Paper text:
Apoptosis-inducing factor mitochondrial 1 (AIFM1) is a NADH-binding flavin adenine dinucleotide (FAD)-dependent oxidoreductase in the mitochondrial intermembrane space (IMS). It plays key roles in mitochondrial function, respiratory chain maintenance, redox control, and non-caspase-dependent cell death. Upon NADH binding, an air-stable FADH2-NAD+ charge-transfer complex (CTC) forms, inducing AIFM1 dimerization and the release of a C-terminal regulatory segment termed C-loop. We solved three structures of human soluble AIFM1 (aa 103–613) by cryo-EM: the dimer (1) without interactors (termed “AIFM1 dimer”), (2) bound to AK2A, or (3) to MIA40.
We obtained reconstructions for the AIFM1 dimer and AIFM1-AK2A and AIFM-MIA40 complexes at global resolutions of 2.8, 2.6, and 2.4 Å, respectively. We built atomic models of AIFM1 aa 128–611 (lacking aa 511–557 [AIFM1 dimer or AIFM1-MIA40] or aa 511–549 [AIFM1-AK2A] due to flexibility), as well as the interacting residues 232–239 of AK2A and 2–20 of MIA40, into these maps. All our structures resemble reduced AIFM1, i.e., NAD+ bound after CTC formation. Consequently, we observe the hallmark re-orientation conformation of the “aromatic tunnel” side chains (F310, Y347, W351, F482, Y492, F508, Y560, and W579) connecting the central cofactors and periphery of the C-terminal domain26. Concurrently, a loop connecting two C-terminal β-strands (aa 487–489) releases W198 of the so-called β-clasp that is part of the regulatory β-hairpin (aa 190–202). Consequently, the C-loop is released, providing surface accessibility to the binding site of electron acceptors or a second NADH cofactor. The AIFM1 dimer and, in particular, AIFM1-MIA40 show inter-protomer variability predominantly of NAD binding and parts of the C-terminal domain, whereas little displacement was seen when comparing AK2A-bound protomers. The inter-protomer variability of AIFM1 within the AIFM1 dimer and AIFM1-MIA40 suggests structural asymmetry within the complex. This is also reflected in the variability of local cryo-EM densities of the sixth β-strand of AIFM1 added to the C-terminal β-sheet in the dimer, as well as in reported inter-protomer differences within the dimer. Although NADH leads to rapid AIFM1 dimerization, dimers dissociated with a half-life (t1/2) of ∼4 h upon removal of excess NADH.
Residue numbers in the entry:
A (entry chain C): 128 to 516, 558 to 611
B (entry chain B): 128 to 516, 558 to 610
Write the structure that this text describes.
């Protein structure tokens, strides 16, 4: 570890890599260090839930390569190891370069001293710092209250090791349970159902909502998505609240708060993510209370020489207000912006970030802005229509704050993202939405 | 007037003057422009309610001079007019200077181009900017729902013009009624009661709590302060919720919720302060929701080249969380810090700020930290009365968050600020608040 670096990037993930590329682009000859707790080079997580599961290659868990939108095979890793220079070489190599320090954890942050302390005891002084620590999966209360053997048969799905372990388990066990109905739980349910269709094993999804992804989509769309997920070979059990999890004859037993009971062999828990804010206690950094994570301004700035990007950043969007987004594209855009601002720009967060999803062949969408179930929605579909506050195969769902669009879900329509982005950018008063819904040309 | 200014300070008051002084101290040769909507040069407010009333000099309204703790007469203004340079003279002068552009209001703030627009259409481009606007007095629903005649007879007390108007009114009218029982209301009640006792007129105070300063002091000290204010010649009416204000035979009449009716011919309204945050709408600046005002960090910074100081800043205290202090000492300290940080330092707010108050001769106190009656309270007096949330001439009050001292009120003891400041600095847990009050000479 070098004793001083011009640019420090805490956490090795999407945001840190994007920031390193921006810093290198704007300031040629910059010398960037990335301190990562994972023993791996930066990689993208989205393939860990969809693409690596549908790969035809048998030995994919060891290879980690997949086909793209075009179909050209690529790796999850952002860059090959030859791209990164050694940390010791970093302050000596010509025109700089990015170096990655893997297996290291920053445990202390002295803002005034412009210093951090690693887990092994090494101390690194910086000129500019980015905190791009992400989040960690939340555990279940009933699972925690159970014994050690119950926790041994539970899985939290974030990293590559989780993907490999879950793939081997699905190959070797007879039934797996998914708890949670958000993004990760639903995608895992679809992938595991696809894998289990061949042999004929059982996969179960149970959660306390009315349907799949009930915090994002309206009720009717949630029920439609639930039915589509059931069509993939998954037994979905909505409105289920876990009371206790136990052991019976070598199989774990789920006793719900209701009268229903479930007996299976393995549990996958996808019950949310919480940001890593253990570093704020020693850094004297403010933690947001409404959203969680570090609190930063419109330029993602926490202190004089400290920026925060990614999932842990509770930033201030000027158009939409205080936010905290947890998505791949937001991590890329936010890291790019923080890298621009670390070299000397003063740009606020302006370009909006989107996200995408695919819950099987039938369901596939992209969304932008503020998308939430509590906010008023206007669903203009094809062959159907519904507004809140049957053939829902195609359509657009506007989200309105005060007669103004703040988020758009584009349901099974493609190459119509710029229209939605321009609608969000203009931010006009919209008392009528069928006049604008024709721009996407749903029919 | 100049097209480009290195250092712009929006709003000229206590914080702006302190910031200009810090800028000049750290960076000799600087060129500071102060844009103020007032027609006057910066002055200090605290003597506008206490010192200028007790002066024996007849024409203090014009001189605006008063005596102090040392006893040396000084002006209400921070500096004499010769100290400042002209606005057109600022760009080209050896070692620069400070120029105040009085009577001009900043109406638009464009952070993208680093340019502001004044109310006369002139544009000024800045390199660093400070927003040191203050607050404006809050009005009353009963007053605002009334007619123009009732509005013309009520007073909101912030500036020098209000002080002159109220002094003339006190010399003229027979009865004065004061709404509000916080700091300003109690101080004006004491001053006008002294003047009335000197003359022989009537002064009345009404507020919706059970005692004076019930949002700062505990209940028993609130009752004690209410009694002591009554001894000053002021008829105090606690628990008076105002319903409507009207006129009857050329005299104002107040009808309260409980049924009491009070007649008078002038009203002084002092019911709080609302921060000036109209610049945030056009500047893309974030306004705090819990406390109000511009939301800044521990370094009092809002954007890349923008700092906020004074009563309008909702800053983050590392040791005490989110705060918004509205006091003269805090304005001085925060303006000083923001002026230092505009020149290159990155110092967070660490030095605490205190506040004092004198309510007659018997009651005089100082306070520091988080002082609020909502927090659990332990008071050490001649008889040790601990509050759960006799003679109380002298004592100390500790305010607790959870077994930790966050604010201390010093009751009729002086030259003991450093002890309380040191106690608050190292906020370690205490088994009981006693044996700590021994540090103060009770
Ligand atoms: C299985 C899966 C599938 C996903 N699919 C999608 C998708 O299809 N679309 C989408 O938009 N989003 C998707 N996401 C979300 C997206 O991947 C995340 O939002 C994104 O990875 C967040 O990037 P980040 O850099 O903020 O955090 P992360 O990617 O979590 O990186 C955080 C890194 O920082 C390290 N770290 C933390 N604390 C410290 C410390 N103190 N010291 C050192 N290192 C530290 C961690 O170990 C980790 O390596 C998916 C996520 C998962 C898990
Ligand atoms: C009568 C009175 C007595 C007080 N007594 C005490 C006391 O005994 N002890 C104590 O601790 N505190 C006391 N205070 C409180 C203390 O005086 C204030 O908290 C302090 O003055 C706040 O300073 P500031 O610089 O933030 O605001 P201010 O002093 O209000 O300065 C704001 C200035 O900015 C100007 N401005 C506003 N908007 C704009 C704009 N858009 N463009 C240009 N200029 C603008 C305003 O006109 C004003 O000149 C008293 C206050 C009053 C009114
Ligand atoms: N396609 C995508 O964009 C995508 C895909 C995968 C993951 N992700 C990200 O991964 C992260 C983690 O995913 P996640 O799905 O775990 O997050 P999430 O926030 O979607 O998970 C919350 C889900 O768990 C349920 N839940 C909450 N508490 C519960 C409890 N006590 N018992 C049972 N159910 C409970 C909620 O009602 C909801 O269904 C998120 O940041 C998410 O955005 C995104
Ligand atoms: N000694 C000092 O520190 C001092 C002295 C004077 C002024 N100041 C400052 O001057 C500013 C103005 O003082 P203030 O006394 O107006 O503010 P304040 O916030 O102290 O006033 C609160 C008082 O107004 C009362 N009130 C609120 N709403 C009311 C309503 N609808 N009807 C009746 N009463 C109502 C409250 O009950 C309380 O008695 C404050 O910022 C204060 O800090 C400080």
């Amino acid at each position: 570890a070098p004793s001083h670096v011009p640019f420090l990037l805490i956490g090795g993930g999407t945001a840190a890599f994007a920031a390193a590329r921006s810093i290198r682009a704007r300031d040629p000859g910059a010398r960037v260090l990335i301190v990562s707790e994972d023993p791996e080079l930066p990689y993208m997580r989205p393939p860990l839930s969809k693409e690596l599961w549908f790969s035809d290659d048998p030995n994919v868990t060891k290879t980690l390569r997949f086909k793209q939108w075009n179909g050209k095979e690529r790796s999850i890793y952002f860059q090959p190891p030859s791209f990164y220079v050694s940390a010791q070489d970093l302050p000596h190599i010509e025109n700089g370069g990015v170096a990655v320090l893997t297996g290291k954890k920053v445990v202390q942050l002295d803002v005034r001293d412009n210093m951090v302390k690693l887990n092994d005891g090494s101390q690194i002084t910086y000129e500019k710092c980015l905190i791009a620590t992400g989040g960690t999966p939340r555990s279940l209360s009933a699972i925690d209250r159970a014994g050690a053997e119950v926790k041994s048969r539970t899985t939290l799905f974030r990293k590559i090791g989780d993907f490999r372990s879950l793939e081997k388990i699905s190959r070797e066990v007879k039934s797996i349970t998914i708890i949670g109905g958000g993004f990760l739980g639903s995608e895992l349910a679809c992938a595991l159902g696809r894998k289990a269709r061949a042999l004929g094993t059982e996969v179960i999804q149970l959660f306390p909502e009315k349907g799949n992804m009930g915090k994002i989509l309206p009720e009717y769309l949630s029920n439609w998505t639930m039915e589509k997920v059931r069509r993939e070979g998954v037994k979905v059990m909505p409105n289920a609240i876990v009371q206790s999890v136990g052991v019976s004859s070598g199989k774990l037993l789920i006793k719900l708060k209701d009268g229903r009971k479930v007996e299976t062999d393995h549990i996958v828990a996808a019950v949310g993510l919480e940001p890593n804010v253990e570093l704020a206690k020693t850094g004297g950094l403010e933690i947001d209370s409404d959203f969680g994570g570090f609190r930063v301004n419109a330029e993602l700035q926490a202190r004089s020489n400290i920026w925060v990007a990614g999932d842990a950043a509770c930033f201030y969007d000027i158009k939409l207000g205080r936010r905290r987004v947890e998505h791949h594209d937001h991590a890329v855009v936010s890291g790019r912006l923080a890298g621009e601002n670390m070299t000397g720009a003063a740009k606020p967060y302006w370009h909006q970030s989107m996200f995408w999803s695919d819950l099987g062949p039938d369901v596939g969408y992209e969304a932008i802005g503020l998308v939430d179930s509590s906010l008023p929605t206007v669903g203009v579909f094809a062959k159907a229509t519904a507004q809140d506050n049957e053939d829902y195969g195609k359509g657009v769902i506007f989200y309105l704050r005060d007669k103004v669009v703040v988020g758009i879900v584009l349901w099974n329509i493609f190459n119509r993202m710029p229209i939605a982005r321009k609608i969000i950018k203009d931010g006009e008063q919209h008392e009528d939405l069928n006049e604008v819904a024709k721009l996407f040309n749903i029919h």
